[PDB]
Design a protein around this motif. Structure first.
Motif, PDB file in Angstrom:
ATOM      1  N   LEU A  40       1.838  13.516   1.090  1.00  0.00           N
ATOM      2  CA  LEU A  40       1.260  14.611   0.282  1.00  0.00           C
ATOM      3  C   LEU A  40       0.527  15.611   1.151  1.00  0.00           C
ATOM      4  N   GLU A  41      -0.225  15.103   2.136  1.00  0.00           N
ATOM      5  CA  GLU A  41      -0.935  15.988   3.080  1.00  0.00           C
ATOM      6  C   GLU A  41       0.051  16.907   3.774  1.00  0.00           C
ATOM      7  N   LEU A  42       1.226  16.376   4.104  1.00  0.00           N
ATOM      8  CA  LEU A  42       2.280  17.140   4.797  1.00  0.00           C
ATOM      9  C   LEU A  42       3.186  18.010   3.898  1.00  0.00           C
ATOM     10  N   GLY A  43       2.822  18.152   2.619  1.00  0.00           N
ATOM     11  CA  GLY A  43       3.555  18.982   1.655  1.00  0.00           C
ATOM     12  C   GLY A  43       4.695  18.241   0.981  1.00  0.00           C
ATOM     13  N   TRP A  44       4.821  16.942   1.256  1.00  0.00           N
ATOM     14  CA  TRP A  44       5.915  16.131   0.731  1.00  0.00           C
ATOM     15  C   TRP A  44       5.386  15.165  -0.346  1.00  0.00           C
ATOM     16  N   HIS A 100       3.277   8.150  -7.608  1.00  0.00           N
ATOM     17  CA  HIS A 100       4.057   8.893  -8.624  1.00  0.00           C
ATOM     18  C   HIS A 100       3.731  10.379  -8.692  1.00  0.00           C
ATOM     19  N   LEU A 101       2.963  10.888  -7.730  1.00  0.00           N
ATOM     20  CA  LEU A 101       2.617  12.296  -7.669  1.00  0.00           C
ATOM     21  C   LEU A 101       3.626  13.126  -6.869  1.00  0.00           C
ATOM     22  N   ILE A 102       4.323  14.031  -7.550  1.00  0.00           N
ATOM     23  CA  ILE A 102       5.176  14.993  -6.917  1.00  0.00           C
ATOM     24  C   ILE A 102       4.588  16.302  -7.372  1.00  0.00           C
ATOM     25  N   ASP A 149       0.829  -1.191   0.000  1.00  0.00           N
ATOM     26  CA  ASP A 149       0.000   0.000   0.000  1.00  0.00           C
ATOM     27  C   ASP A 149       0.883   1.270   0.000  1.00  0.00           C
ATOM     28  N   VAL A 205      -1.390   4.807   0.376  1.00  0.00           N
ATOM     29  CA  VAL A 205      -1.816   5.370   1.666  1.00  0.00           C
ATOM     30  C   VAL A 205      -0.619   6.109   2.284  1.00  0.00           C
ATOM     31  N   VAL A 206       0.571   5.532   2.172  1.00  0.00           N
ATOM     32  CA  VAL A 206       1.782   6.213   2.616  1.00  0.00           C
ATOM     33  C   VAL A 206       1.967   7.530   1.848  1.00  0.00           C
ATOM     34  N   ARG A 258      -0.314   9.364   0.485  1.00  0.00           N
ATOM     35  CA  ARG A 258      -1.314  10.357   0.930  1.00  0.00           C
ATOM     36  C   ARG A 258      -0.874  11.106   2.185  1.00  0.00           C
ATOM     37  N   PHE A 259      -0.398  10.383   3.196  1.00  0.00           N
ATOM     38  CA  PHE A 259       0.107  11.062   4.415  1.00  0.00           C
ATOM     39  C   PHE A 259       1.182  12.080   4.034  1.00  0.00           C
ATOM     40  N   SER A 315      -0.431   5.612 -10.093  1.00  0.00           N
ATOM     41  CA  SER A 315      -1.092   6.076  -8.857  1.00  0.00           C
ATOM     42  C   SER A 315      -0.356   7.219  -8.185  1.00  0.00           C
ATOM     43  N   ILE A 316      -0.904   7.709  -7.061  1.00  0.00           N
ATOM     44  CA  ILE A 316      -0.299   8.838  -6.343  1.00  0.00           C
ATOM     45  C   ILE A 316       1.087   8.532  -5.767  1.00  0.00           C
TER      46      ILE A 316
END
Lengths: 391, 391
Positions: free
Chosen positions: B195-199, B285-287, B186, B189-190, B192-193, B282-283
């Protein structure tokens, strides 16, 4: 022996206290994040004002509204006579090569200016549902004759001008849903494109809603000093963004439970049937860096002294927080709080300053006083409240 | 009549050209994004150097590496004798309350310093697979005796020091996968945490890999001037980040097709069986903001003049781009390009400057010369190449 429930709480198995799973590490990073504008009681009037301004500056920074070299003005593309009111459909042009729409309900024989209510729908829903009309395509249709759904129509029946907007990727703004998926809109794929570009779903949909609000401030028949924003479910998120950015909005209807979403993500770690720890919601709700600045209770608290009603509970702690901010602003009575009927009696609630970790969706909703089968627009509380605040 | 395939290409149905679906609007926003450091041919030597520096500055900005008040140094927690080499396991401490690990293979009877290869695994894979060992837990085990998998072991058999790392959320860094989901980590989910924190997932895993690279630069038995980074599949992403940030890395192995990922997201719009337009990945790969600055061909191009091998194709256009940058750097011969055997003969390829829109995963892979069943670490190309470049 083995028991999946024994994995609900994330903790170190090392004498040195260190965490090895990336899940545990990033979860700890969130636990260790202290939002900059978390509301604190006991501030001087100057400190309160400065805090309120700081919240707005942070919102501007994270929402990343673009400056768009002026596009054409909104245009009315349709007007129809209804029983007691007129339904107008408008196009607006938020960016080059783009178009969006909104609906306007005007009471029949409207004389002077009247209050205007910007109605923002829930997840899976549309502006057509809000005005009590069938969908733009049949698969997008809601239970539009149910007054629990038709928020905007309810507002025009009270003699107010109602303006109904869509949420990005839903309804008339949808893609292929009218052919199959229907109400199950692909908000997330839209969110991914926006996130890749440094933006977010909420930043986008709020930028669009701001244009509709700007249009309402220019109408001679809408009292500029009596504009209300009423959000159901998901719609409470753009309402919060608009409320923070525009101090001239008169009042707010918050029809969703008030959630401290950072805590939720920290505590809702109990594995599901697939042995995953699902995030509380999807990337439609990801605004990068939001939690470095605040949580929803702090944000709504900063709307003080504007009249605001909460119709669907949350934790007693978060209602206390909002109440304290309203007291500091000088109008403690302007914030009104309600629980779901199931949890209205405090004897059945657990009033704690911190939730326990190891919750799942079911136990989390229990802890925060949410009764999902009774989630709907609370006309029974909102209509009478509006009658009083709009005088 | 109705045909889902007629919806593959996103286009306006309005005389004014405007787009109504949020999907179409955000897709157009991506089409209208012109990356700042897109490589351009014909630059002066000064312009080339400045472009290369700009790419690095942009990478630093988007990767958001933290400055961490010094944690303890890495510690060797295990050493074992193997047939012809020694296997060491090390712990490192990237943040307070956190631990990560890596494996080191050292040739037996190692005399003076030798080249070191940092081995980064693919999606669904682990450092144990890379060193030819079974999983830390049985469900995490790979086909570790297959030389197509055991990249690190292959490197120690060549007389090099091999250092094998994990990708964030995978292998020893995993959470509940050892109980059920296994290789299906997963990562999201990692992500997402973070990304929420600006990383971001890549920012995180690259920050960890940088600590391992820093450890390799401190070993007396590793030639500091002969450190190579070899990435398989997903592992090519942190390799790119480390290569841009550290000009002293000697050489690179890029074992994945070279993808212009912005174009991919623009062109892969053909609806699938669920009537969705799935995002290409998926996310994990989101930067956020990456495409405002560059694409993978521009990034790898900026690694010039470091020797680099591409073992699994991509578009002829993107190989030309990298080749032009290498020529501008003064070592055109240092970049070496290979296609998948299926597409090695240019008579079977379509060499276009722009892909057509309306592709799905199958047709996109066809267009960019990718043969997924033959995706694996190309020892047959890499081992001989390394023998020559490491002299």
């Amino acid at each position: 022996g083995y028991q999946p429930e024994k994995h609900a709480v994330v903790k170190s198995d090392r004498g040195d206290g260190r965490l090895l799973s990336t899940y545990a590490i990033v979860h700890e990073m969130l636990k260790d994040t202290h939002p900059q504008y978390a509301y604190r009681s006991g501030m001087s009037a100057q400190e309160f004002t400065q805090w309120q301004d700081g919240v707005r500056a942070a919102m501007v920074e994270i929402m990343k509204f673009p400056e768009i070299k002026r596009q054409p003005s909104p245009v009315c593309v349709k007007t129809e006579k209804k029983e007691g009111y007129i339904l107008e459909k408008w196009e607006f042009y938020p960016f080059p090569k783009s178009v969006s729409t909104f609906l306007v309900l005007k009471p029949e024989h409207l004389k002077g200016a009247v209050p205007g209510v910007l109605c923002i729908p829930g997840s899976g829903r549309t502006k057509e549902g809000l005005v009590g009309e069938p969908g733009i395509c049949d698969k997008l249709t809601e239970d539009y004759n149910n007054p629990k759904v038709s928020m905007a129509l309810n507002m025009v029946k009270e003699g107010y001008v109602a303006v109904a907007v869509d949420n990005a990727a839903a309804g008339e703004a949808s893609d292929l849903e009218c052919y199959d998926k229907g109400w199950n809109y692909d908000y997330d794929v839209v969110s991914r494109f926006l996130l890749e570009l440094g933006w977010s779903w909420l930043g986008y949909t709020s930028y669009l809603d701001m244009q509709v609000l700007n249009w309402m401030k220019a109408q001679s028949y809408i009292r500029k000093d009596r504009i209300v924003i009423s959000g159901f479910s998901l719609g409470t998120e753009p309402m919060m963004v608009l409320g923070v950015l525009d101090k001239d909005i008169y009042a707010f209807v918050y029809n969703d439970f008030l959630c401290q979403t950072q805590e939720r993500a920290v505590v809702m770690t109990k594995p599901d049937k697939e042995n995953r720890r699902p995030f509380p919601n999807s990337i439609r709700h990801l605004i990068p860096g939001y939690w470095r600045y605040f949580n929803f209770p702090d944000v709504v608290a900063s709307l003080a002294p504007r009249p605001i009603i909460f119709t669907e509970g949350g934790l007693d702690r978060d209602f206390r927080l909002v109440q304290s901010a309203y007291a500091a602003s000088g109008k403690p009575e302007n914030a009104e709080f309600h629980h779901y009927p199931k949890f209205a009696d405090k004897a059945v609630r657990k009033d704690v300053e911190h939730l326990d970790e190891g919750l799942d969706s079911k136990t989390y909703f229990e802890a925060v006083n949410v009764d999902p089968p009774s989630h709907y627009f609370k006309n029974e509380l909102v209509i009478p409240w509006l009658r009083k605040v709009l005088k």
